[PDB]
Write a protein that binds this ligand. Structure first.
Ligand SMILES: [Mg+2]
Length: 226
């Protein structure tokens, strides 16, 4: 469907604004390989956008790992805490966010990451995340399930004042679960997937781009870059 104008933007964090998915990947690969299993792209495609416990359970079930979701979360989080602060902004992220800010376009963050993980990941980036109108995290009491459940995006949209119609919201996502959550919420979505994701999982979004650098805001009725 052709892109329609929007007034409010909602961003994913992991893999979209920050390069944190590579950190998850290295840690889960190390754990999976102990058990002679490969933490592969098909598995990643299932768990990106999920809350930590949800993701862990899926990894365990799909790869048949001999652990509980609680054990996998505890171990992986212990390892990830050491490296989360090294997260870096993705290409085009700063340019876009600063542009939206200048033009007073409301935008917010909607991430399945919990509080502690968010705090660690954003250690070097507090000035960037301070530009968001508001932030909804995965441990928000209003949000029961991770993506592809639409609740995190619905909750995020409802916290703008005044709240927009969902159809005037534009989501930015790197993950197929996030694309599905946006569509289920009645929102348009720009996907910026890793090119290793399958064709089937990267042909559902309103627009699919190789980089945020390629996003043309005017396509959605927003101001062009200066
Ligand atoms: Mg993501």
């Amino acid at each position: 469907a052709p892109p329609q104008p929007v007034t409010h933007l909602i961003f994913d964090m992991d893999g979209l604004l920050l390069d944190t998915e590579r950190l998850y990947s290295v840690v889960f690969q190390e754990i999976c390989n102990r058990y002679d299993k490969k933490y592969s792209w098909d598995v990643k495609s299932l768990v990106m956008g999920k809350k930590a416990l949800e993701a862990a359970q899926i990894i365990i079930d799909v790869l048949q790992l001999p652990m509980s979701k609680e054990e996998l979360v505890e171990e992986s989080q212990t390892k990830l805490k050491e490296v989360f602060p090294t997260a870096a902004l993705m290409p085009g992220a700063e340019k876009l966010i600063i542009h939206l800010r200048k033009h007073g376009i409301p935008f917010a963050l909607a991430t399945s990451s919990g509080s502690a993980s968010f705090d660690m990941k954003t250690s070097r980036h507090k000035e960037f995340f301070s530009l968001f109108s508001h932030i909804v995290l995965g441990d928000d009491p209003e949000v029961q399930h991770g993506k592809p459940d639409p609740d995190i995006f619905l909750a995020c949209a409802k916290r703008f004042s005044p709240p927009p119609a969902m159809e005037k919201c534009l989501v930015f996502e790197d993950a197929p679960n996030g694309v599905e959550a946006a569509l289920a919420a009645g929102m348009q979505v720009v996907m910026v997937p890793d090119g290793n994701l399958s064709r089937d999982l990267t042909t559902k979004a309103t627009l699919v781009l190789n980089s945020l650098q390629d996003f043309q805001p005017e396509l959605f009725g927003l101001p062009s870059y200066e």
